[model samples]
Target: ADNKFNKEQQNAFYEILHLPNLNEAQRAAFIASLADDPSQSANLLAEAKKLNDAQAPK
Candidate 1:
């Protein structure tokens, strides 16, 4: 599959995914989560959503 993701974008993407210190399993889970599955990606996205939904301003 064409990744469609550049290195810089991937770095920002990881930050957005709340995976700065991601372990092996988390990394694998993240990749698997984005594999042609919007629901799975949404599940992974929930991790970041929590942070966004916190006391931080929009």
Candidate 2:
């Protein structure tokens, strides 16, 4: 469960995994982009969490 990334990065990782219509390369690129730009991870994590929350069943 440890990959040297923070909570935001880890959430983004799972967010990308659950996204639709993305190829393997795209998924890798998205996660790597977060690693390369830590600042973006927080924003992406917020959006990702909101998205997942909306999709979750009650």
Candidate 3:
């Protein structure tokens, strides 16, 4: 409960964690890195959204 993630950050974290292209190791690394620097949440969210858009059927 003490983690710095706000609602938006939590949403980004969930989206990234659910990304199918990332393996377990990648997911763990992302989580660890995000924990170290919660300020990067928006950037991570933007990148994750880009990936999601690219992977979506158009």
Candidate 4:
């Protein structure tokens, strides 16, 4: 369970975690750890992504 991740989840993980040396497996592990209210997490992730994306360099 909780193995599937939407775009927001992935974005939130990368934006907030800032684990420079992090691997995909490690990110998957972190995703698995947050099982409560996937909907909430996804929503938060989307909101955060919006903010993070603004700072992206061209």
RMSD to true structure for each model, in Å: 6.6, 6.8, 4.5, 7.9
Model 3 per-residue lDDT at 41: 71
Candidate 1 local distance difference test against the native: 0.53
Clashes of each: 0, 0, 0, 0
Candidate no. 3 TM-score: 0.59
Error of 1 at 53 (Å): 13
lDDT of 3 by residue, 1-58 (tens): 5666568778768877878765556567667767787788777656655665676667
**CA lDDT of 51 in candidate 3?**
63
For candidate 4, give the lDDT of residue 30. 51
Best by TM-score: 3
Q: Model 2, range 1-58, lDDT digits (tens) per residue?
A: 7566567667677776776545556557666777788667766556555555666564
Question: Candidate 2: deviation at residue 28, Å?
Answer: 1.4
Local distance difference test scores for all models:
0.53, 0.64, 0.70, 0.53
Runs of candidate 3 with Cα error greater than 4 angstroms are 1-5, 46-58
My TM-score estimates for the predictions, one after another, are: 0.37, 0.47, 0.59, 0.34
Show the lowest summed lDDT stretch of 10 residues, model 3.
Answer: 21-30
lDDT of 1 by residue, 1-58 (tens): 8665455444544654564445546556666656545435545556554545552454
Per residue, candidate 4 scores C-alpha lDDT tens digits across 1-58 of: 7657577665665554564444445445555554545555655444444444654453
Compared to the true structure, candidate 4 yields what TM-score?
0.34
Full candidate order by TM-score, most accurate first: 3, 2, 1, 4
